[model samples]
Target: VPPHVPFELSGAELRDAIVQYATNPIYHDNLDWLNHDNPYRRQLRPQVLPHLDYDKVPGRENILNYASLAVQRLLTSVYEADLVFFPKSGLKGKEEDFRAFYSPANRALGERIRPALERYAFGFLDDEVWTAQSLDAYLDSLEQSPVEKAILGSADRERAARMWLVQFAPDFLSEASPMMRNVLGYYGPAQSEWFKVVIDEYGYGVHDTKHSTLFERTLESVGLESDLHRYWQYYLNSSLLLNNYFHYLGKNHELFFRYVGALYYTESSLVDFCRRADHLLREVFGDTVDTTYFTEHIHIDQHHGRMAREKIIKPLVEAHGDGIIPEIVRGIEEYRVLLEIGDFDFSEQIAWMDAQPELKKLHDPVFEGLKQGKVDAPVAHLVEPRGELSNTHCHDGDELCHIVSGTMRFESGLGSSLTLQAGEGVVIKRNRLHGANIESDECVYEIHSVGDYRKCL
Candidate 1:
């Protein structure tokens, strides 16, 4: 059974909270809705480059770590781009609060005492708990990704990368939109101007010109629907966590400084990444798909990234002094780490699925039934080496191809050429052109074209 938990930080730990956030750099991620500019954040970073132990954090294990500093460049220069950000808000705040008595330490933080009146109960808010085991596992996988090489590379590889990212564009900036929505109306001159710049760039005057809308256009240019959350299941946990990074910071206004850093890194990095996106999309998808979304960012994020620096971070640093600077720097770096995680997952998932077919021996899959219908049950087939099956038949729904022992080469009409090996799989779109070539002595693979698309972020 789960243990009982309280809902608020105790009064006893309150000063220690401030003093902790004040004195120690840990436990400083954020406190929900406490106070936007309250001192929790001023504890993060300033002279950080030397101190950051890359191997310690989960995100460092991801491939994009190089893409972000992406290691090559240090995290000191605040304006360099290629990062993606999610909303900064709290998690486990509401739903998981009741079951707090799980561990002795968690239960210890379960309740708090008031200054004079009573004790307050609350949940764990420190890094020890926040960056829990599951997150660490995900980060570890990202760091130790096995597919460091490419199969059937060149423009083909580039196209596969573009397809994965295009699928990601529909929901970009969506999570953070709410963070900026109501808060921008009333602000100091520096912030007011910043809000104005972002709002305009966000397409306040023209709904059709909105960033999400432009993304929708890009979607339609490809085969995906322009609707929101169409491929919800396809998002990996890391992707969702990437989105949550911002909300973890923004959920409480108390995390304001961190939010500033997160937001600045986001707006600025888009300028660099989107430029690359435009070039890649053009190269891969050709003029076939509308790339307005990337081109738009290439143009506007330049201004937004600029505003984040000149109007926000600079003003914030000059006014708040160096104490807040570290938090700002922390936000930039932390979000960069998160960005790398998401990108690494997106890029490698495709590579892994594509390459899985070739890595193992061939065998007969246990028989799974198949039929002709809207959703057929999984089917197992053993194809012989150089066993080539050429068919024009498309499954009514999507298909999943997993090699039981050997490798299979799959090419979709959309131009995705995948060499799936044992223990690997790839999706075949509904009614799309798909054919396979058996690459081993006897290739045993499972094909399940049913169930909603599984999210692999």
Candidate 2:
């Protein structure tokens, strides 16, 4: 037999259930699904479902749900507890004492908890008893929370909510750093070279100086001893359960693409989280060396996040085309799911500031602008062609002119009279004075290489 019941439904029937539950239209669009070679179906049924062993594995769904819930609970509890114990004026100048008391234990606990959870989660997913029905059940269990329900309620809303959520997913999920390495590895030689250039970002491959190394250093600077992989034990009690859930979506290359989408969402969302974290650190530490890393992230991640989107995602999509758009969308959505689950931790930290009267003054307009989405950031600009050619002016930048409905004659630096008819286009280099006269009444669409006007300046 097939190990277990196949939901006793046809492919169409199963797809409908999944679409209804996931609320992703790509599933319902048969043509899209067929054209994508039913990759999603293969993913859910053959890969994810079997790993969960049809959800017959005892406490599988509950464990996964609780793992996600535990992260939220722990963060919220930490925030509330910290606010209750710490001074409202903030811990200023006494961070060492705070670390001696709280930081080391927390870091150690995280090291212990994260890996255990990953282990347990991945183990269960590797089982053959879990069915698609069980996997859905686990996801459904995650839906018990009203906040999560609202965010995942509709496709557009889910996409938006997950966009925010994915940024902070790394906070809860322990494997992100390692997974990033694997992803980099998949790109092979090109990324190996690229990674070398960015390796300084990870503190030059030194265990103590890597990005995670910095996090450990920050933890230790607060008087905590840095322990690698220690947080995974306690915090991630249900590792096999949770890792299986993550693996269901992570192991397959196709599913891995969704993970990339999640990363994109996470990177995009981090712009704000880093700012908030920096604000919190500044309030608590008061312009000290301890807060520098967080501050750097607040500033640097702004550019890094954009580069991740424009440089990484845009090119990937352009190379892959519309065929992968849905996968991209899925990856983006899953990331948002991770973020919504983790928002309370950051929010509660901010709430700490709100409760204290003296600290309220510390709120800066610049930080508020970031929180309110008023930061001046660059987005890709569109090019529109103009046909009014009374005078030809040339400056730095490339220009592409195409005749849409008329004939035009172009005189260039070489003194060549090139005649362009409808549907013809010409490329002009920077500083080359080329004038166009319409042979007859016509329109043209010209793409001028402004050469990223913002960057040029």
Candidate 3:
């Protein structure tokens, strides 16, 4: 059981405390659990900046910037609401804690404050510039990206599609399980049935029928382990975002509505995802194996989707009215963006693997040694093709971009007209400019950070 913080504080003090906690990038990340090897951890780590700004973060130059920004928005709104209400521990972190923390003054004010909190959350989530797009529209765009289409035609399409499961089977229903846990944690008799039905669908305590079990069984057919997340280093950066976003809701009651919205979108989307997955598997591996993992979603998520909307979302809206609607919509739109980036970004990674199979373990030259020692990570060159690395970025720790196989030319921000060639690289003093670009396609190297190799050499 978790120990409790005194519920003695409230108002400005409460809000300020939450803000101070959030201002540290570390708290927002790796909270509740440590995914020691999230492949995309470097990029997806939430920023310390509390406002809407992705322009400064190095690996955040992607389509999900808005989603990341809005995630900050949701987080702010959660804390804002968290200050108004608070967490308690009547049963030492049991479900009673939340209800027990509901002060009588707060209890009466709950209805009044709820709508306002809903709007504040929606205000951040309901960005007019985003145009309130739905998940399907966003996913449709992903299916049509240049990289995604390229993979369909690639000779390595089958291998690329199948490799995805290494990330998928572990924590299968990865997002859904957390969403379910959050909704259930908030279980009042009013909402219990909504949680209970999904519980049944998830196979509850039944091992063989369990969704994660089926995914593991599918993995076994492919000669892999039931251990979910047995392999993490190769997982995509976007994959980390998906799970992180799911947990953001799971671990906090403030994100309940967001969880509901994300749940509805994913549950509905899985109907399509599972169908495509089954077809993809059949195409990639042929009829030699079991597809119960994907097939199960086809059969179950349809019901799960309807249940979320009709049983859960619809009832909440009917009870809560217009104020609650925005959060639901915010979740739908936000998840659309999350899923979109993931769909396209991952397809690009697969394309990379097909084009440069060496790319699969490109960093092994530096990383293999890191794995053998007790150290947590590695440092190696991240040789990108021309122009991609030239962007103005910065690193927290002292760094280097040693060019082992490329013709790197600089122009300030590490700028100088001198061209760096094979066996030569430059030291990027910590907190300086992002590097300049290479002139050739032969650029290849590793990033050096966290792991010490210079002394050993």
Candidate 4:
């Protein structure tokens, strides 16, 4: 029954098992089975290996130890059947070869795993199904189970679990499924390179580079030295399930792509909070490698603002036409529900509020604004002014200017001014400062010239 129900281990138990299994050489070697037919194997080694050097003593040991601990913890905590049966596959080799191995069976398995993973990740009931009246009743019903309460003893474990779910699960899912691979790779190698940069930003291998590092650094800077995974003993089955849901959504459930809209929304909305974290890190640690990650995110997300629109919404609209707008709207609403979970951690919210109090007022309004079409700035006014004017310079990346108001003249470096009125945009090449003489106090929005906002030099 239920495809022979592979493993009985609970989430906490499986985490322990992952730690145990990672210590075994056979388990480590068996991972090679994942790469046996890897299509990108050759390309990956050359491209990625050069950027990383894992042979340096303490670094190497640190990596090995972390890997061992992570694997062991995950294997013991998560469901084995779910892990094996998840729709995605590992990307250890070449693209073509990987796709060849990515067959209908993979898709079928993914489709099957979707519902169970959703239940496990989001909860038994979809938030969409929960009416406001029912939500009030649901909150009333959340009487703390002593057993569940005891599982998560401290804020540390909760934070760790959250990070594990948000960051690690999607990664694991991508490693397992092919459709995800396709979505991830849709923008080509430049986009792929940018993704690698993001992984590095997330602190993939090194403890210092990882978000965990940032978390620990935040703790230590504030004078807390709780060793890594020290709180594992206190973790409960429910906590494990919550963590598992992140992994499932991130790693196993593709249907949760809609939920990802909320995630992106949160990220976009929380830029100032991250800036505060960066400020805190700087205040505590001074200028250092760890502080760079937080600071970089703040600067990078600025450009990501447009890229998100281009990659996520524009493409979806183009591909599905207008039929999918409802889906997009639904996804955004679902994302809002998911984000409400963060509100429970009010201290972090307060920290964010303290950092950017203006955001507190702006946040909810912005979402409302999006729905009301108030956020829709016309694209046509990107480039403005008509007459030929010279010596215009933009210090930012390339410019794509759209004319939003009255007739404006745009002058190129080579001395050419193209007049554009409201509702017209032009792509200005990178680093060329083009000036505009407003014929009517025109407003124009410029799209910066960079593919990946986060990785810009």
Best by TM-score: 3
TM-score of each: 0.49, 0.37, 0.52, 0.35
The TM-score, computed over Cα atoms with residue i paired to residue i, of candidate 3 is 0.52
CA displacement after TM-score superposition, residue 177 of candidate 3 (Å): 3.2
In the range 1-457, model 1's lDDT, one tens digit per residue, is 8987845543334434323222233222222211231111211211222333332323233322212221121111111111222212433342232222122332232122111111110011123112223322432332222222222253355445444654463245352353563264455656675567557656875778877777777767766654333333233434444554454454445567777767766775677667766766676667787888778767653546666666776666567666776566556666766565555655554553444333121211211222224344556565565555432223445456667788776654234456777776765544233456676777877776454332211
lDDT of 2 by residue, 145-167 (tens): 33333333422332223222222
When summed lDDT is taken over every stretch of 10 residues in candidate 4, the lowest stretch is 40-49
Candidate number achieving the greatest lDDT relative to the actual structure: 3
Off by over 4 Å in 2: 1-176, 181-200, 206-209, 229-251, 285-289, 300-303, 344-457
Better of 1 and 4 by lDDT: 1
lDDT of each prediction vs. the true structure?
A: 0.45, 0.37, 0.49, 0.36
Candidate with more favorable, higher TM-score: 1 or 2 = 1
| Residue-by-residue lDDT tens digits, candidate 4, 273-320 | 557655543543454424443554686554343454446545544554
Q: Write down the RMSD of all candidates, one decimal each.
A: 18.0, 26.8, 14.1, 27.4
Report the CA-based lDDT of candidate 2 relative to the real structure.
Answer: 0.37
lDDT of 3 by residue, 115-215 (tens): 33233332333343112234334424436444336446666665555556764642473324554656454554436755665575568868678776677
- For candidate 3, the lDDT comes to 0.49
lDDT of 4 at 330: 49
